Amino acid sequence: MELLQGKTFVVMGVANQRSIAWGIARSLHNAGAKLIFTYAGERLERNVRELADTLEGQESLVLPCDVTNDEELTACFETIKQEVGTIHGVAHCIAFANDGFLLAQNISAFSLTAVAREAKKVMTEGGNILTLTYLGGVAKASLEASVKYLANDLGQHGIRVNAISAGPIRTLFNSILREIEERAPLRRTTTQEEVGDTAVFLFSDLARGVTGENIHVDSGYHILGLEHH
Template sequence: MNLSLEGRTYVIMGVANKRSIAWGIARALHEAGARLVFTYVGERFGNSVRELAETLEGQEPLFYECDVTDDESIIQTFESIGKDVGTIHGLAHCIAFANREELKGEFLNTSRDGFLTAQNISSYSLTAVARAAKPLMTEGGSILTMTYLGGEKVVQNYNVMGVAKASLDANMRYLASNLGKDNIRVNAISAGPIRTLSAKGVGDFNSILTEIEERAPLRRAVTQEEVGDTAYYLMSDLSRGVTGEIIHVDSGFNIIG
């Protein structure tokens, strides 16, 4: 079987900086020979994703600004990608957001607006993006999203984002069921805690990491590279029979009671 991704094009959404999980995925797919297309939101991150992408040897990546709260922005982005590259073979959705003040304290106090914001950016965006990307997946494809254990079990402080990830997980399964007839697979990676910009300043991240180091089967945290390698598997033909699945890349922490 050909494990190279040469001749294939993948859209990577959600690189904010070099610590981003999306960047770990981009590097793994680049090493496998893929052509990459990046989307970002806001000029600040547009510049940083350009600088990062320039470090990928032999790659002439393309960049599009895409705010997933805006249907028109999503439609325009994928129309432009279609015009510029034609067929795409996969998409990595690495996007989540909740208001900082709702990622601590009592879940009971979650506001309607905060709840809907988390659902909008962190879950609905997957449906909207899949719909816009489908016409470009003329040879079938693989859609991947990023989830977290807090959508399956209660994790302190994850709060409104836990409900959004539960929604994202179901969203992923319904999309998998819907798009299977088009040979488009849809899966999620549930990553263990990784220190990224999103993780900064929210909850007690250090104590969560310490718990992983003490109690996870592998007794260590995972890296962006490890998530990237599983993303490579999900984008490659090795995973051709896998859809609607959540793969935990979390040192096995999810099995511990």
């Protein structure tokens, strides 16, 4: 409720109001954070500006940042350095890209390292880098290794690196959702708000001892070992 007061975070991956990243943004906002949003292209630019505009409180920067474009990614964090100086985390949470879910998984896998490289330059007081896998796995193997590499590389600078694995979300197939509602320990599917509230923890000082972790927000389904069912 004031867990994140005084802290500023970059949120990547907002496409519309049902985006997992918009759940993260809403949660971070409610915990008192200032937000900087990125947008890939012209289409998403408007969607992000309009959603950001619906938040009440500290102004939100909205900046271009195609994470597959090294020049633009670098430019984005240069703008951040010049205008706010220090940030306290990045939500690398692109779960759909313009098939679209797989595309986002691949882009997430090969862009995390460069994102962390630029983020380190403006996280001079430490903080957390969050990445997201949406379950709704060559790229997953890659992301897992990258998180461990970056956690080990950046921890000495006070920067934690963690992942959330989010289960299928109805507003994002009916046979898959029914299986989860019937068989997952919590007997329900995941929400964007549940993912966002776990992100609040990971970005907060409560999680200062947690790094290199992959937290499942999937109603417990992961414990069942039903990957190939």
